[PDB]
Amino acid sequence: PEVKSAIEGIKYIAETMKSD
Amino acid sequence: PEVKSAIEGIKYIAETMKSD
Amino acid sequence: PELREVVSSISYIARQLQ
Amino acid sequence: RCCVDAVNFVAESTRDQEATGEEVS
Amino acid sequence: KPAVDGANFIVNHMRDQNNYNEEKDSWNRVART
Numbered sequence: 622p623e624v625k626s627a628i629e630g631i632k633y634i635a636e637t638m639k640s641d
Numbered sequence: 642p643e644v645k646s647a648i649e650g651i652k653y654i655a656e657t658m659k660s661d
Numbered sequence: 662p663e664l665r666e667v668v669s670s671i672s673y674i675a676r677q678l679q
Numbered sequence: 680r681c682c683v684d685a686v687n688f689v690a691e692s693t694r695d696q697e698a699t700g701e702e703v704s
Numbered sequence: 705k706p707a708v709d710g711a712n713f714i715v716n717h718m719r720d721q722n723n724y725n726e727e728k729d730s731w732n733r734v735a736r737t
Binding site: 643644646647648650651653654657 | 708711712714715718719722
């Protein structure tokens with residue numbers, strides 16, 4: 622689940638940067 | 642070796658954030 | 662689609678940083 | 680597991696920063 | 705492959721940012737002295 626969590630975190634970072 | 646260098650750079654980013 | 666999501670996210674982040 | 684752990688730490692730090700920013704707001 | 709290039713660009717940007725901040729902190733300590 623580590624890789625899946627990392628991928629979800631990267632997606633969250635991208636979405637957060639878009640909102641910012 | 643560029644992929645390994647990128648992985649080590651991501652590790653460096655995590656270490657930087659921890660120190661910060 | 663996980664690899665495509667990763668690629669799109671990383672490309673967006675890199676473009677924003679540039 | 681280096682990349683996975685590093686990305687997890689980065690995501691956690693950024694999420695906590697955003698959570699604190701919400702309280703600031 | 706594009707992910708590796710984007711990661712490398714991000715790492716270079718972060719390293720440049722860190723160097724810049726280090727130079728700023730050095731100037732700050734010089735000013736305090």
